[PDB]
Amino acid sequence: VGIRFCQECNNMLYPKEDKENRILLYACRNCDYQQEADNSCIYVNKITHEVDELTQIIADVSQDPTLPRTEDHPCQKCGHKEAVFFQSHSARAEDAMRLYYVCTAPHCGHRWTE
Amino acid sequence: TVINNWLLIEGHTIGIGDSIADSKTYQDIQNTIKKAKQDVIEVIEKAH
Ligand SMILES: [Zn+2]
Ligand SMILES: [Zn+2]
Fold this sequence. Notes:
The structure is cut from a larger assembly and holds chains A and B.
Chain A: E1 14-17, E2 24-27, E3 34-36, E4 69-70, E5 83-87, E6 99-103, E7 111-113
Chain B: H1 2-10, H2 23-47
The structure holds zinc ion (2 copies).
């Protein structure tokens, strides 16, 4: 799901239905080029945003010297004691105080939440 | 008039001794501030 682009002209594909046949396809209007679709979903909308931020937050924040860091919570894979923690940044959730943790070592990009 | 002219005898003032309290009162205040900060720390840890 998300955008796919036509090969002939590098423009947006958008969907059309094969009227005689009942199969959906993607057709770029700027040309004749077509694709019977793999994405049986055309539009999805995550209204409640229950999603955890682990993909948005990233390992390099471990290098921030103004962030707090504790030895209490160990990393899962390596178990290095030092792990920097910080709050959420999602504006819109049923909760607003949970802590996101990142492993502090230069060679262990690993992350968790409590 | 009469009460100003009487106040001429007793006088009134303010000073440092009016603002310094007892050492036990200071200890009580410090203890209260300590438990209060500890309680706020406990609340923060509960939210965490
Ligand atoms: Zn095209
Ligand atoms: Zn780790």
